[PDB]
Design a protein around this ligand. Sequence first.
Ligand SMILES: CCCCCCCC(=O)OC[C@H](COP(=O)(O)O[C@@H]1[C@H](O)[C@H](O)[C@@H](OP(=O)(O)O)[C@H](OP(=O)(O)O)[C@H]1O)OC(=O)CCCCCCC
Ligand SMILES: CCCCCCCC(=O)OC[C@H](COP(=O)(O)O[C@@H]1[C@H](O)[C@H](O)[C@@H](OP(=O)(O)O)[C@H](OP(=O)(O)O)[C@H]1O)OC(=O)CCCCCCC
Lengths: 47, 47
Amino acid sequence: RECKTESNTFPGICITKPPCRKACISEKFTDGHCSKILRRCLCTKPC
Amino acid sequence: RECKTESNTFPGICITKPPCRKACISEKFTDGHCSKILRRCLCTKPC
Ligand SMILES: CCCCCCCC(=O)OC[C@H](COP(=O)(O)O[C@@H]1[C@H](O)[C@H](O)[C@@H](OP(=O)(O)O)[C@H](OP(=O)(O)O)[C@H]1O)OC(=O)CCCCCCC
Ligand SMILES: CCCCCCCC(=O)OC[C@H](COP(=O)(O)O[C@@H]1[C@H](O)[C@H](O)[C@@H](OP(=O)(O)O)[C@H](OP(=O)(O)O)[C@H]1O)OC(=O)CCCCCCC
């Protein structure tokens, strides 16, 4: 499992992963990716 | 926002919140509650 939340800083619609991943790393998470249907940027890190 | 993940220890279908909240506190989260449709026990804590 991972601990997950929505990015505070990622702007725009989440289309591809790397821009979201990078925003999430800037927010002190280890990764990020797009939510499937709503296209939010979700940040993840170890619990 | 909070950081959220699925409980490792909560047994059974999540029907009511307090049993899930208790399991999540035992896993070093600050709260927990039932996922709406799938009835998982989800734990939460500050990011
Ligand atoms: C009956 C409808 C049910 C409503 C409630 C259904 C639940 C709900 O509304 O929230 C999310 C849902 C889909 O969310 P979306 O795909 O954006 O986000 C995913 C969703 O949150 C999953 O639950 C996550 O898995 P988990 O849980 O972390 O394991 C998954 O994380 P990951 O796997 O990507 O890491 C996320 O990507 O959004 C809609 O259904 C909009 C319906 C559009 C219109 C529908 C109706 C007009
Ligand atoms: C257009 C329809 C497509 C989207 C349909 C809806 C698709 C969808 O995303 O549902 C999620 C469902 C499990 O969702 P479930 O309700 O168990 O869990 C919720 C889900 O994780 C939300 O995204 C969370 O909010 P957030 O994101 O953290 O803010 C919410 O957290 P909280 O608020 O409790 O803390 C959780 O309770 O997983 C499936 O998709 C397969 C089931 C299929 C269900 C229906 C399919 C027949």
